[PDB]
Write a protein that binds this DNA or RNA. Structure first.
Ligand SMILES: Nc1nc2c(ncn2[C@H]2C[C@H](O)[C@@H](COP(=O)(O)OP(=O)(O)OP(=O)(O)O)O2)c(=O)[nH]1
Ligand SMILES: [Ca+2]
Ligand SMILES: [Ca+2]
Ligand SMILES: [Ca+2]
Ligand SMILES: [Ca+2]
Length: 343
DNA sequence: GGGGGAAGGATTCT
DNA sequence: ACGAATCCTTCCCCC
C-alpha cells in the first residue's frame, strides 16, 4: 500500500566499541576524545556512553569541561579506523535483510523491507531478529525505527534510544505532523529552526498556512518542499545506495599561524593521509580548507580537466593556501584538504 | 532569457 | 576550545 522503512542506529557507538574491546569498562563512564594537541587536554568529546551523558558529558563539549564534571571517568583517544571496521561488519549483516539498504553514516542505515514483511507486526519482529543478531554477533546494542518513510523511521529511533525499537504507524504519523516540534525534524538545525519561528512555524503542520514562496524565500526551496512534503504526509524518498563523494583530512596546528612554512607541514600531512585513504580513487578536484582563529572556515579549490597526482596536489594546495592567506587576514588555526570529483 | 558549470560559503549531523 | 553531504548565491560563457 506504501513503503515500510526500518532504520538502524547503533547506541553511543564509538564508546560502546571501546567497551566491547575492553568489557572491564562497562558500567563506568567512558569518554572518547579528540585530542587537538594544543595543550594537555585541548580538544572535544567525540561521544560518551550514557553513564557519562547523564552528567552532561557528551559529543561536542571540550575535554577540559568534561573532566571538570567527571574527573574520574575513563578518557580514551578516538580510534576511527577501528569503529569503521566494526561498522562495516554490522552493515554486512543488515545487508542480509534487504537489497535496498542505505548506509547513511558510520553507524546508521535504512532498510526497505517493503517486500520482506506485511504490516508492522512482522516489521516489528524483523526488528528484534536484527537487534538480537547484531547483539549476538558483535555484542553491540542498537535502536530500531520503523515507519512509512526514512524521516519517520529516523524519528522513531530518536524516540526509542537507547537499546530500543519503535514503530510509528500511519495513524500516529498524522499526530506527529501536528505535535512534533519542527525543530526535531531531521535536517532542521538551529539556523532553520529560528527562521521558522520568526515565520510562526513551530510544528510541521504550520508549513501549510504559509505562502509557499515565502517559505522558499526564507529557508530555500529544497528545504521548503521537504517540509511541505512531510507536512502533506507525502514524503517518499526511496532507500538508496550512496557512495563516498569526498575524502579529506584536516588538522589542528599547535599554534595559529600565517607563516606559510609553519603551515605547510600540517597541510602536507593532511594530503598524505588523504591520498592513502583515497585508495584506488583519482580525484579531479582539490580544496584547501582552513579554520581561522575565530573558528571560522575559509576554503579555496580548483577542478582539473584530469585526475590529480600527489605531486600536483602538493603544488596546487600550496597555491590555494597562499590565496587564503592573501584574501583573508585572520590567523589560521586548522588546516586541511578535501578531494572530490572522483574519476 | 535560459542552460551548464564552477567557486565559495551556509547548514546540518553525527 | 574535533569527516562529509546537500544546498544557496554569485559569477561566467554562451546560444
Ligand atoms: N568527532 C566527532 N564525532 C562525532 C560527533 N558526533 C557523533 N560523532 C560520531 C562518533 C559517535 O560515536 C557517532 C555517534 O552517532 P550518534 O551521534 O547518532 O549517536 P552516538 O553513537 O553518539 O549515541 P546515540 O545515537 O545518541 O545513542 O558518530 C561529533 O560531534 N564529533
Ligand atoms: Ca548512534
Ligand atoms: Ca547515528
Ligand atoms: Ca534539530
Ligand atoms: Ca547525532
Amino acid at each position: 500500500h506504501h513503503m515500510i522503512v526500518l532504520f538502524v542506529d547503533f547506541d553511543y557507538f564509538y564508546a560502546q566499541v571501546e567497551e566491547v574491546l575492553n568489557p572491564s569498562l562497562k558500567g563506568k563512564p567512558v569518554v572518547v576524545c579528540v585530542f587537538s594537541g594544543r595543550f594537555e587536554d585541548s580538544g572535544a568529546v567525540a561521544t560518551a556512553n550514557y553513564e557519562a551523558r547523564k552528567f552532561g558529558v557528551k559529543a561536542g563539549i571540550p575535554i577540559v569541561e568534561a573532566k571538570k564534571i567527571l574527573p574520574n571517568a575513563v578518557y580514551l583517544p578516538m580510534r576511527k579506523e577501528v569503529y569503521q571496521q566494526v561498522s562495516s561488519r554490522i552493515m554486512n549483516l543488515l545487508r542480509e535483510y534487504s537489497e535496498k539498504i542505505e548506509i547513511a553514516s558510520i553507524d546508521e542505515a535504512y532498510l526497505d523491507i517493503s517486500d520482506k514483511v506485511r504490516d508492522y507486526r512482522e516489521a516489528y519482529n524483523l526488528g528484534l531478529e536484527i537487534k538480537n543478531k547484531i547483539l549476538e554477533k558483535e555484542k553491540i546494542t542498537v535502536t530500531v525505527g520503523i515507519s512509512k518513510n526514512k524521516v519517520f523511521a529516523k524519528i522513531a529511533a530518536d524516540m526509542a534510544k537507547p537499546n530500543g525499537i519503535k514503530v510509528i504507524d500511519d495513524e500516529e504519523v498524522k499526530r506527529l505532523i501536528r505535535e512534533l516540534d519542527i525543530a526535531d525534524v531531521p535536517g532542521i538545525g538551529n539556523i532553520t529552526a529560528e527562521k521558522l519561528k520568526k515565520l510562526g512555524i513551530n510544528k510541521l503542520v504550520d508549513t501549510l498556512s504559509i505562502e509557499f514562496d515565502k517559505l522558499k524565500g526564507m529557508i530555500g526551496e529544497a528545504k521548503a518542499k521537504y517540509l511541505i512534503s512531510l507536512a502533506r504526509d507525502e514524503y517518499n524518498e526511496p532507500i538508496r545506495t550512496r557512495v563516498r563523494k569526498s575524502i579529506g583530512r584536516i588538522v589542528t596546528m599547535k599554534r595559529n599561524s600565517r607563516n606559510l612554512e609553519e603551515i605547510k607541514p600540517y597541510l602536507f600531512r593532511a594530503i598524505e593521509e588523504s591520498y592513502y585513504k583515497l585508495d584506488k580513487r583519482i580525484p579531479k578536484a582539490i580544496h584547501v580548507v582552513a579554520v581561522t582563529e575565530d573558528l571560522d572556515i575559509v576554503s579555496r579549490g580548483r577542478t582539473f580537466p584530469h585526475g590529480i597526482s600527489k605531486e600536483t596536489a602538493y603544488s596546487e594546495s600550496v597555491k590555494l593556501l597562499q590565496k587564503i592567506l592573501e584574501e583573508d587576514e585572520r590567523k589560521i588555526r586548522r588546516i586541511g584538504v578535501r578531494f572530490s570529483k572522483f574519476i
